[PDB]
């Protein structure tokens, strides 16, 4: 449970060669590396990162052969990431004024992995390269790189300054289309030098010969990785095993393993109160002090306190021991099936819980897997869905839920989501929005809003192949809160004087719809504004925090 990812940073004159209106590829790589390293530092994940450079004037190659291998400097070896790491990637001021072989960087990273991870346990090693593909090549390698067919858990992941989405994505527009962290529009495809073409070709051939056809989708653009969790792909640890047994009746039991799935995730670290005199937590001290009601008291001790539960207008004195004695007692973890109901009496609105489960199968023994697959296929080809009584442990409360069939071209399993209890449900009374006469919208308003929603559609039926090709999707953007917090913490740790930096531009471009949607909606938005009589500055408060008592100069 410890990865070893090596970042193969590129520094070169062509790397810094840029055009107005577009960030330098070196700066884009710096942004991506800063994001990745700061996430893996401020989350305190236990894995070793190696940073190697290629293309700088100096050559500090640990092996370096007997000659050649020039202009590839190994900045740091396999170590736990430190603050100095991202400090000096922000202090790696000068891109090298030279050019080095691209494949030489790959073999340098490979030999670093081999010579630093000989006997240490590493769950999966990794090599990530952020290159330009604009340098002279060497057609003598790939006879040992490919021959090393991953007789180890090292893998490849190439990041290029291109717009690596390799389908019908012509674009080539001139509305300032490129934005770091932008979405949909990207770098103008094609218009590619007579070296980057063969560079991409041999990169594609390497990936095909390494992972297969599925490896084509494993190469990303610099702006793409700022809005995707693709750098940490093949480093993330799987959800932990949860064994149980799905039972129907009394004698029908199938060994099962429910792996965790989509669940809200928070920040692991915590803010500790510290006195502002010596920066020590030990000086601070807090404690609850229970005090009586009449004319205060000296103290009321812990041992003289008992529980109490409100019941009506008075209080009935319960106790901790009585709660433990007389309360609901289940029979440990259980995944019993109450029955089967049509997959139309449960609706997405009547869901609960902060998590979703994917009850996969038993373990590798393919005995219960056949039975579970038969059950899910019988649920899927037919209709109706299985209700389940699920309990985590003896202490955890038992909960009901639904287990929809979920069949994919790669795996087959059910999915669990909690249902509401009787007291858990709330019914409200709302006025009908269709029978009303005051708010019935006229035909002109209907047509205007129809044109509006047709203009701001976030999905194109491209190629007419009955495929709803998706525009900006929100289920792949990483939570911006964590990246913003990491940037703020890093700046405070490096510049303890400056105030909080403003939000990065690429984070803003990450969370905003593609420019085409915004542009195509201007006229419909104007028509809606001039047509709907929705104009009210009804005097109701205003957001003021600091610009009410401050000065000017």
């Amino acid at each position: 449970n410890k990865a070893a990812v090596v970042l193969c940073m590129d520094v070169g004159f062509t790397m810094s060669n840029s055009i107005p209106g577009i960030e330098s590829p070196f700066e884009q790589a710096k942004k991506v590396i800063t994001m990745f390293v700061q996430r893996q530092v401020f989350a305190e994940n236990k894995d070793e990162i190696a940073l190697v450079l290629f293309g700088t004037d100096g050559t500090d190659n640990p092996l370096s052969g007997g000659d050649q291998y020039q202009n590839i400097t190994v900045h740091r070896h396999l170590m736990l990431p430190d603050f100095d790491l991202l400090e000096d990637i922000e202090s790696k001021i000068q891109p090298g004024s030279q050019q080095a072989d691209f494949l030489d960087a790959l073999i340098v990273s490979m030999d670093v992995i081999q010579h630093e991870t000989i006997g240490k346990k590493f769950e999966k090693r990794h090599i990530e390269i952020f290159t330009d593909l604009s340098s002279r090549f060497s057609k003598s390698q790939l006879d040992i790189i490919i021959h090393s067919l991953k007789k180890c858990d090292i893998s490849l992941q190439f990041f290029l300054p291109f717009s690596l989405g390799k389908e019908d994505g012509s674009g080539d527009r001139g509305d300032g289309p490129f934005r770091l962290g932008g979405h949909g529009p990207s770098f103008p495809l094609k218009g590619i030098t007579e070296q980057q073409k063969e560079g991409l070709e041999i990169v594609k051939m390497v990936m095909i010969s390494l992972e297969g056809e599925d490896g084509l989708d494993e190469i990303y653009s610099f702006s793409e990785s700022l809005r995707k969790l693709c750098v940490f792909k093949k480093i993330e640890r799987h959800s932990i095993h949860w064994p149980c047994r799905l039972t129907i009746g009394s004698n029908l039991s199938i060994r099962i393993a429910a792996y965790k799935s989509i669940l809200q995730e928070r920040v692991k670290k915590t803010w500790t109160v510290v006195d502002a005199k010596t920066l020590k937590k030990e000086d601070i001290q807090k404690e609850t002090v229970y005090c009586l009601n009449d004319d205060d008291e000296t103290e009321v001790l812990k041992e003289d306190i008992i529980q109490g539960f409100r019941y009506g207008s008075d209080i009935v004195p319960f106790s901790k021991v009585d709660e433990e004695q007389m309360k609901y007692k289940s029979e440990g973890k259980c995944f019993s099936v109450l029955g089967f109901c049509k997959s139309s009496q449960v609706q997405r609105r009547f869901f609960m819980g902060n998590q979703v489960l994917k009850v996969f199968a038993a373990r590798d023994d393919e005995a219960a897997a056949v039975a579970l697959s038969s059950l899910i296929h019988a649920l899927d080809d037919l209709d109706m869905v299985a209700i389940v009584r699920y309990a985590y442990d003896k202490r955890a409360n038992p909960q009901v839920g639904v287990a929809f069939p979920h069949i994919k071209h790669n795996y087959e399993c059910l999915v669990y989501v909690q249902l509401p209890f009787m007291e858990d449900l709330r019914q409200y009374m709302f006025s009908s929005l269709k029978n009303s006469k005051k708010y019935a919208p006229t035909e002109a308003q209907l047509n205007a809003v129809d044109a509006l929603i047709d203009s701001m559609s976030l999905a194109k039926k491209d190629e007419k192949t009955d495929t709803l090709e998706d525009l900006f999707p929100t289920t792949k953007i990483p939570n911006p809160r964590f990246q913003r917090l990491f940037q703020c913490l890093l700046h405070r740790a490096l510049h303890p004087r400056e105030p909080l930096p403003p939000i990065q531009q690429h984070i803003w471009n990450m969370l905003n719809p593609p420019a085409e949607v915004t542009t195509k909606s201007q006229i419909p938005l104007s028509k809606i504004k001039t047509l709907f009589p929705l104009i009210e500055a009804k005097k109701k408060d205003q957001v003021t925090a600091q610009e009410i008592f401050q000065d000017n100069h």
Binding site: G249, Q285, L489, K540
Partner: protein
């Protein structure tokens, strides 16, 4: 509306035939009525402990009311239900309870049926709060109280009509007794709910009293906005909507600390005490902090809330997505509800209705950036247009509006391990289909109750009325294993033979010298974490939880 509290007044008969009944195991109707009132009290104190309940026996020999009237007794006045109020009522249960009532209240003493209704209106009119609803149940085992005197019947009808005009809806829960008569009679023009019924003359069973579903001991009724946000279609055109929640997790009320000697609540006082030098500290000399390895990051209190602010509170629309792109697997939080409100912006309802109509016409869902409070990071939301659905009884079950659906970020999606695809075959998928069809189920939302909450509430009831043993809740979420096994039949064994292989079962002591010798011995082996912890604690060294912490600290300090 919001601050109004429902109110209830019972009206228990105490006639001679009301007490005497058939001589069998069936409960006397008086005991049935008292048990039902006790059940209503128990249900209404755990759920919505703010309504007013009062019980007014009529037909008694005694009399207690604001205006002196014969044969009417107000056992309790309008107030919140309480444990003492329940205990004041259970003494009338049983034959001994019947005798206690007879010696304490009496029976017979022919009444008027009008002054009782006047008295009920008196307590209804004596409340200094709002009156959301006013109801009067009339537990009676007779259907024709009068008939020998038409004047009393006319006066009762007039008073009932006056009560209905005032806004008082009475509904009698008729009690059945031996004989053949509980006919629809001089009570039909009195029931101000006027519930729809076949009105069959020859009823031969207890009336709508089992309809109570006695002791539905879990509920917390409330309706509130929970937010009032602005939906920005663009930078300049904004509409105002409210964000209600339709389904929300139910939790038992928090416990209260008590002083053992006096059994009175003790107020708590949390305050950061001195730095071992005396005094108290400011919110201005205690900055927040975090530590990563050897690097300490020191950050002020307000700057901590400053780094998690992105947008002003509101829903920033960002486009429309087809409904077929909202996968069922993705789910984080319970789905919220949006309704157009016209307090901050006038004209929001019309634009909202047009948007809803043309958004569910094209089967698309609005996509927005959601920020509920001042300093919360943005969270994308797909507003699914929920069309109003209504029953034949003109009852709304899915009110119209927009429903939030929290789309998870990529951070909130976990990755599964690789598994091998193994598919079934015919001739056992058919068997599974037969089993499933043999286990039909019409799932409903009002099906199950939280067993933990039910047990806790029953325990509280037992501890507040000394029931001498807690009521054992029938765990509704427990599978009926024997019944479903008998219903299934032998085809389960046909399944088991079909796929499962025949061999597949499916199921202190330490001191200076020993540690000085052991550090050179270098094991610190069978030495358990519980005893390393006690050694480091009783000796006074810094201690943690992981073994390596102690194994390093004790080794480095004890010798060096």
């Amino acid at each position: 509306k919001y601050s109004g509290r429902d109110s209830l007044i019972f009206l228990v008969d105490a006639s001679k035939a009301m007490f005497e009944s058939q001589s069998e195991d069936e409960l006397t109707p008086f005991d049935m009525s008292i048990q039902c009132i006790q059940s209503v009290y128990i249900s209404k104190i755990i759920s919505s402990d703010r309504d007013l309940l009062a019980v007014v026996f009529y037909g008694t020999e005694k009399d207690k009311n604001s205006v002196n009237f014969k044969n009417i007794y107000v056992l309790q006045e309008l107030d919140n239900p309480g444990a003492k109020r329940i205990l004041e009522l259970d003494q009338f249960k049983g034959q001994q309870g019947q005798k206690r009532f007879q010696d304490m209240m009496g029976h017979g003493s022919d009444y008027s049926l009008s002054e009782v209704l006047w008295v009920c209106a008196n307590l209804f009119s004596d409340v200094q709060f709002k009156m959301s609803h006013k109801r009067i149940m009339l537990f009676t085992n007779e259907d024709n109280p009068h008939g020998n005197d038409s004047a009393k019947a006319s006066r009762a009808r007039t008073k009932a009509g006056d009560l209905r005009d005032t806004g008082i809806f009475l509904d009698l829960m008729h009690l059945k007794k031996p004989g053949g008569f509980d006919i629809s009679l001089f009570y039909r023009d009195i029931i101000s709910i006027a519930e729809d019924e076949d009105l069959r003359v020859h009823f031969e069973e207890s009336s709508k009293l089992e309809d109570l579903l006695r002791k539905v001991r879990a509920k917390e009724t409330r309706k509130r906005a929970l937010s009032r946000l602005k939906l920005k279609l663009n930078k300049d055109i904004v509409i105002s909507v409210g964000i209600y929640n339709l389904v929300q997790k139910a939790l038992k009320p928090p416990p209260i600390k008590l002083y053992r000697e006096t059994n009175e609540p003790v107020k708590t006082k949390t305050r950061t005490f001195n730095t071992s030098t005396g005094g108290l500290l400011l919110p201005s000399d205690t900055k927040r902090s975090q530590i990563y390895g050897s690097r300490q990051i020191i950050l002020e209190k307000e700057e901590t809330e400053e780094l998690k602010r992105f947008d002003d509170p509101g829903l920033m629309l960002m486009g429309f997505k087809p409904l077929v792109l909202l996968k069922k697997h993705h789910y984080l939080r319970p789905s919220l509800f949006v309704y157009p409100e016209e307090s901050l912006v006038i004209g929001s309802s019309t634009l909202f209705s047009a948007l809803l109509i043309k958004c569910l016409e094209k089967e698309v869902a609005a996509l927005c950036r959601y920020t509920p409070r001042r300093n919360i990071p943005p969270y994308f939301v797909a507003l699914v247009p929920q069309e109003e659905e209504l029953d034949d009884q003109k009852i709304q079950v899915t009110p119209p509006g927009f429903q939030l659906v929290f789309l998870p970020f990529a951070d909130d999606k976990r990755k599964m391990p690789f598994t091998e695809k193994i598919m079934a075959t015919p001739e056992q998928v058919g068997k599974m289909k037969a089993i499933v069809e043999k286990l039909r189920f019409t799932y409903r939302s009002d099906s199950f109750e939280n067993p933990v909450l039910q047990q806790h509430f029953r325990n509280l009831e037992a501890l507040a009325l000394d029931l001498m043993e807690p009521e054992q809740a029938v765990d509704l979420t427990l599978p009926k294993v024997e019944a479903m096994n008998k219903r299934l039949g032998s085809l389960v064994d046909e399944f088991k033979e079909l796929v499962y292989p025949p061999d597949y079962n499916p199921e202190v002591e330490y001191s200076e010298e020993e540690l000085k010798t052991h550090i050179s011995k270098g094991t610190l082996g069978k030495f358990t974490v519980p005893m390393l912890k006690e050694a480091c604690r009783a000796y006074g060294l810094k201690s943690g939880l992981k073994k390596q912490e102690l194994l390093e600290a004790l080794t480095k300090h004890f010798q060096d």
